[PDB]
Paper text:
Malic enzyme 2 (ME2) is a mitochondrial enzyme that catalyzes the conversion of malate to pyruvate and has been proposed as a therapeutic target.
Both structures display the canonical malic enzyme tetrameric assembly, with NAD+ located within each active site cavity and buried within the tetramer interface.
Author numbering:
A (entry chain C): 22 to 575, 577 to 580
B (entry chain D): 23 to 367, 374 to 452, 458 to 574, 579 to 580
C (entry chain A): 22 to 574, 578 to 580
The structure:
């Protein structure tokens, strides 16, 4: 119906002003573009110049996402050019604001919307998706959008943004990516009264119908695209996130980045710290502020790391303590202890702490991990206590956004006199102490892990993702940190290098999957690096010029 | 492009206004969020998102983005807020957009025909995907109103112009064709700009230029028909007049900068005459300027005078012009071309006013506040009701302000401007906007299958514009109908021009309608969504 | 979505092996065709060779129509190459046999099917037709397929075949042609019991629903395509055909070829005969065998011609007699005479004849016209009587099919010793007499009239078609007979020349329409011949080669 030449109308093939003169003439585009032939380089520079003239992150978001619908290769190029700056525009924290502020005007689909009203008919919706070879699905129900809570269908930006990073960071083919928003209602009263809300006007269905709908989705996706289709859950509520991971992980190819990706990036930072503090693992003691999704994810992966290094499971668990909103998790406390928290709930020490500071002084941890999301609870006295107890205290302030962090880099470095090994969830710039020393703290961003893991799983035709895959990814991340970087105080490789980092993780994870009988792509490649690098999708333009050539044309017909 | 055509095609796409049944039957279920909206709701969302934006440029970018997604929604939004949005989608915002942002292409915006394509223009015209073009707007970017030579960075102008063809007069958008002709630019900044989107050469001013324009006119009419309306916009003055003269009897063509300007200015003068009722033979017009606008307006004034019973010669004798080189008089120092000769019969303009004693002064100089307090007072001295038109744009280049005009004449002046002014005993001054004329004229010409456009058409359009003023409006000193009513005004102008065309044997659409009002109103394009629901029904109830 | 290159898959644009090497490479067809580049000339010769190895007319039909669905321009080239021989294959009498024998396997739509079950929803069916600029519609309900009777939806082929002749003969653009079959049931008992019948299993609806459906169709077509859209009715039952022509001719742009085309082609033949027999019109006497729809249509057009040449209507009517299955139409006879027959019913002569031979001897006509559909009733005694009464007797045997014709050409020329001016509606070949003289009999084929009339009406944006248009067409046809042809007693131009003949008719009719204020296309062309010839559709392939060229030979 859309009248015009398909190759310029389709964002997947469209090159815009980068179509060559001969391409334009042969493909019937001559006159439909201005009389200037550009390269992708020039198009990209025009974009970057224009973006600088816009004020709010939201204006930027609207501009850059517009390009995804016009010229796909230009879009990914622009993103890759300025990846560190643009990742928080296209994804968290900007993405979640955009729908609520602006909404959207549709032309091309953004992804699949599956509502509770569609129960019994989900396969029909999946069959409406235009692409036939989906390899990566990211799904949300919008209940727990990181930093915003329940946005209902206004969270469908989150899977879209996530998959932009799958492609930009690890070269997963954009045409094989499928964002999905599950709409079972919203408990956000403001949205239910909003005439411009784009979802169902009902509270969240929490009946068996909810579970049945998620089941129907999983079956429909894998019926169409295959049982090895990667399905990643994102921004579900805590109960749902954990139980769906448990329900599906041995039946489908699935992971939850909020739980498992978090665990791996955190662990990687701790393994980097161990490069400085090389004392035996038997002497480490980890104290968490918080006992929620992040704490449990991280702690369970620390235990697997410790078990690999000679400790028994039970002994490893005894080196991890947690302190939540109600205090120290000890056996027989008043506050509730769920089954996930039970292995880290130990017999009370002689003195029972009231405050986190008291807990530090009594337990004497080597490491504190802040995942409470409740502001500056790593107080000056907590930080000082850590530096008094340990020569090189490990302090991870992972809560986001910056306002919710347990402390700043500034506080950490200054109050420990440059001795702390520090990492954060939110971005902090260099810290100069008065004695001249400069510290560059790392950010434990989930983007270090999920692109590379996803690529490896897909390329290996892997069918289930064990926690041990995330342990391997954590080790592969840390293995890329140079000596010079560690000396600067970095516990993570630079974010600017995310493309190279992701590919290197994919190679290591691919080696692991083949070595542990988790791959099904045979023949098995002899050189895993070559295998991965040859399959990554490239943002450079292809030639679309028809092949025109003379035949020899040297006897005539009778 | 993989997906459902009806959704991907902006001409048919309804977005969230696709109904539940439409979505299911057409295979769209799940490709849109689970909310059924109306066009009304989509429009309200857009208006909110726009009111939460500040930069005219950023508004332009956002609005024009809608055109490439959902055509009906785009035009709905324009129509809803037409007075405020016309300055965004057209002059003066549109000229700024390209130079500052450029464009990222997906869908074609229109045709680009370069001097490098000489000999091959027909193949370019044949690449345009629409088969039934009725309205072409063409520029070479040489004289963008307010900005000068922007070369290819002025394709935005035809685009925005044709948006107003549709929004104001209901000309079908699929039958509109914007055209930019690129023969180079003399803008040195552009020639050194790596982001410039045109040919890196000075303007070709050889015979090759004339030949390319000829080739263009032939190619367009070869494909689409000899009656295809071709409107010239933002050419340099020499080229504008000479091309109008060259093509007007050979093709269906007009130049809005010359003829539209003339008509809208005349309409204002006619509205003033209704209030003043000064005997036409006692009128004397003094122009500040003797360029394109002046010659255009003067020629139409003469035609108006002649139809009322003056001879051409005596009508011309009532018009004087005063340019940058002083008064235009026979045997002066400065150059007097043959276009100026009819109006060539004091060292400052103030002196000119005092020695000639005009009833009307028309400011088309583009050179700032040359209607000084002195000039105004001297007009108010000579005349009971002075006519002062300060047409130069933008606001800062105007000959005087509205407040200045009324204050210094004790509210006795009949005043109009090219640039906008708020109410100033309250006087509500009118803005002589070209949008009053071109949409209605273009619609009438198209619906009538007219083949050539006489100057009398623009005279008729001027009278039809003035006739829509109410007595109340005239008593407030308003010389132009409210811009908010541009749709109604444009249709009314179209009806009057349609009647004129049939009566003077310039229409070729037969049979001829008995009721021209109905004829025009039934043919205007509508931005309301249509039903796309397949027709499903049971049959009545086999060896 | 049919995967591949649209230009190749679409029969309208497809050139097959005539795609040039450069076209194939640039359009992404290289390797999808054999490595040989042919011209349309070679493709046509291959077809013609293959056709000769087909035996039955049915087999030839299936083969040639297959090409329509593959390569439209090749199809029309082929039809034009061998037009005289192929018109009887693509149209009557072969076409009606095809569905009954074979049915059809559908891919592309052949045309629109509108059933009585679709009443109230006809517009949505018309909206499903993929072409947006239809100028020519041919519609049937399948009730009276010429020579075959009620075939129901198995008469789908007739509108298809007719429109093929619109294109091939007059250059009406094929994408602007729309065949339509109205299915309201069938009275054919054989079809009702046929598990392979492709229509509704019911008797024909003869209620108000039938009339309402036809009205809904007319409105739906003109609502979509415009009030000037030409709608031609074909192979309706006689009475339905007549009443619908009356109902719609002043409201829509419509004609019925069975009524009006027939009358025009018959008249043309008679006008040709009159050029040979200089006798003044007032001395002609015409006797019809039959007094039905064909007799009345022809007679009414003869009268219009006679009135134009100085006779009063009443006096013109007095020159025409009719003899039906009950005998001569005379005032006061026992057998009913209906109101339409009354103008040609006269006071009985001295003797009332019992047989047609007796009627010939008693009335002594100059001309007999057979339209009884009852077999060989122009007996040798009838023929000999005509040749003893008249030096040059005019004998038209127009009944169909051939078995029902009143006599053969052989019979007519031999028994009149070569003196008769003869025409039939059947394909009789040349007749050689013993003295060596060869006679080529005229065929009153409607294809002489309908293509040229259709083209003129469309090109002029004509809105209604008067009977006077068919009179003009008849004169325009006869005007093309050369002096040499007139001497040899040819009453029609050669069928081989049908393209040229049709265009010449269209030019004359266009002139007529403009001169009588029946055209609405303005500006009016000064030169009507040029106007028409520049607008006829051509079967020559166009170039589909993209335009590739160098530009004349940048800040960093
Ligand atoms: N940087 C990263 O890669 C990353 C990854 C995941 C989560 N996070 C951040 O971690 C934080 C927590 O996320 P989550 O999903 O685990 O949250 P959660 O709601 O699942 O867990 C919160 C926990 O904090 C405890 N808590 C709250 N207030 C407290 C207080 N004042 N003192 C002690 N404990 C308190 C609660 O009892 C609970 O155990 C958030 O800020 C989130 O952004 C960062
Ligand atoms: N299997 C097919 O449908 C198909 C179709 C055409 C060609 N081929 C060819 O067959 C060979 C093997 O086919 P294959 O597709 O299994 O390749 P592969 O086996 O090398 O790829 C391994 C897996 O990763 C997927 N994959 C590869 N690169 C990807 C990327 N960048 N983003 C997302 N997923 C990616 C593949 O779909 C597959 O599941 C290749 O030479 C290929 O060109 C296969
Ligand atoms: N009117 C349009 O919709 C249209 C569309 C595109 C281009 N044009 C151009 O306008 C000029 C005149 O075009 P026009 O269509 O008005 O032609 P026209 O006015 O010369 O033709 C008169 C009428 O005959 C029809 N017609 C012409 N040739 C025909 C054929 N071979 N078969 C069937 N119908 C036929 C036309 O559709 C029209 O109704 C040409 O230069 C043409 O390229 C017109
Ligand atoms: N409101 C409308 O509908 C409308 C339409 C067209 C043009 N305009 C305005 O009219 C103005 C003139 O446009 P144009 O195309 O006629 O310009 P132009 O270049 O064609 O003519 C300019 C004329 O002004 C004279 N001039 C310049 N500076 C002068 C000075 N200081 N003193 C005296 N004379 C001086 C020049 O000699 C020349 O005769 C512009 O500001 C434009 O915005 C308004
Ligand atoms: N001519 C065709 O190609 C065509 C195709 C399909 C249907 N029809 C029907 O045939 C009849 C004849 O219509 P017509 O189009 O010849 O004449 P019209 O009376 O409908 O319109 C007169 C002229 O104005 C044009 N026009 C009408 N509305 C317009 C608009 N809103 N914007 C721009 N141009 C506009 C037309 O193209 C035509 O040139 C109508 O009933 C129409 O629906 C015509
Ligand atoms: N396009 C056409 O429909 C067309 C064109 C030319 C010729 N024809 C043929 O002309 C013939 C008549 O068709 P029609 O529609 O006028 O038929 P009809 O049924 O309307 O009229 C037949 C007439 O012949 C008379 N008749 C029947 N048997 C007779 C007999 N034995 N002796 C004398 N008269 C007799 C009937 O009484 C009646 O007057 C058919 O063979 C038909 O195919 C048809
Ligand atoms: Cl571009
Ligand atoms: Cl929308
Ligand atoms: Cl072939
Ligand atoms: Mg495939
Ligand atoms: Mg069309």
């Amino acid at each position: 119906k859309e009248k015009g030449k398909p190759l310029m109308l389709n964002p997947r093939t469209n090159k815009g002003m980068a179509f060559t003169l001969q391409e334009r003439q042969m493909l019937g585009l001559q006159g439909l573009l201005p009389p200037k032939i550009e390269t992708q380089d020039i198009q990209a520079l025009r974009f970057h110049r224009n973006l600088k003239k816009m004020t709010s992150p939201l204006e930027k978001y609207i501009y850059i996402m517009g390009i995804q619908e016009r010229n796909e290769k230009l879009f990914y190029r622009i993103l890759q050019d300025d990846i560190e700056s643009l990742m928080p525009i296209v994804y968290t924290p900007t993405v979640g604001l955009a729908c609520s502020q602006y909404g959207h005007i549709f032309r091309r689909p953004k992804g699949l919307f599956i509502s509770i009203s569609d129960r019994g008919h989900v396969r029909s919706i999946v069959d409406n998706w235009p692409e036939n070879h989906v390899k990566a699905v990211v799904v949300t129900d919008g209940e727990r959008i990181l930093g915003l809570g329940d946005l209902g269908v206004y969270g469908m930006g989150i899977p879209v943004g996530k998959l932009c990073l799958y492609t930009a960071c690890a070269g997963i083919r954009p045409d094989r990516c499928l964002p999905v928003c599950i709409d079972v209602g919203t408990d956000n009263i403001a949205l239910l009264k909003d005439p411009f809300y784009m979802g169902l006007y009902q509270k969240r269905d929490r009946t068996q119908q909810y579970d049945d709908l998620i089941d129907e989705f999983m079956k429909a996706i894998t019926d169409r695209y295959g049982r090895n289709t990667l399905i990643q859950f994102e921004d579900f509520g805590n109960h749902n996130a954990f139980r769906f991971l448990r329900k599906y992980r041995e039946k489908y190819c699935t992971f939850n980045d909020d739980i498992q990706g978090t665990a791996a990036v955190a662990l990687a930072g701790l393994l980097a710290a161990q490069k400085v503090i090389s004392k035996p693992i038997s002497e480490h003691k980890i104290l968490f502020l918080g006992a929620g999704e992040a704490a449990l994810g991280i702690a369970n992966l620390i235990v697997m790391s410790m078990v690999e290094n000679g400790l028994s499971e039970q002994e490893a668990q005894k080196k991890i303590w947690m302190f939540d909103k109600y205090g120290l998790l000890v056996k027989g406390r008043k506050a509730k202890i769920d089954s996930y928290q039970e292995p880290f709930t130990h017999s009370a020490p002689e003195s029972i702490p009231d405050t986190f500071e008291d807990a530090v002084n009594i337990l004497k941890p080597s490491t504190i991990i802040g995942v409470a999301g409740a502001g500056r609870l790593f107080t000056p006295d907590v930080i000082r206590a850590m530096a008094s107890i340990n020569e090189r205290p490990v302090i991870f302030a992972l809560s986001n956004p910056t306002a919710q962090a347990e402390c700043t880099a500034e506080e950490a470095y200054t109050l420990t006199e440059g001795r702390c090994l520090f990492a954060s969830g939110s971005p902090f710039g260099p810290v100069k102490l008065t004695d001249g020393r400069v510290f560059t703290p790392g950010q434990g961003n989930n983007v270090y892990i999920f692109p590379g893991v996803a690529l490896a799983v897909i390329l290996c035709n892997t069918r289930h993702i064990s926690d041990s895959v995330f342990l391997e990814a954590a080790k592969a991340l840390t293995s890329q940190l140079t000596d010079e970087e560690l000396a600067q105080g970095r516990l993570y490789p630079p974010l600017a290098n995310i493309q190279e980092v992701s590919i290197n993780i994919a190679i290591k994870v691919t080696e692991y999957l083949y070595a542990n009988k988790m791959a099904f792509r045979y023949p098995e490649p002899e050189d895993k690096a070559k295998y991965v690098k040859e399959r990554t999708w490239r943002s450079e333009y292809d030639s679309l010029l028809p092949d025109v050539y003379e035949w020899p044309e040297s006897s005539s017909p009778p």
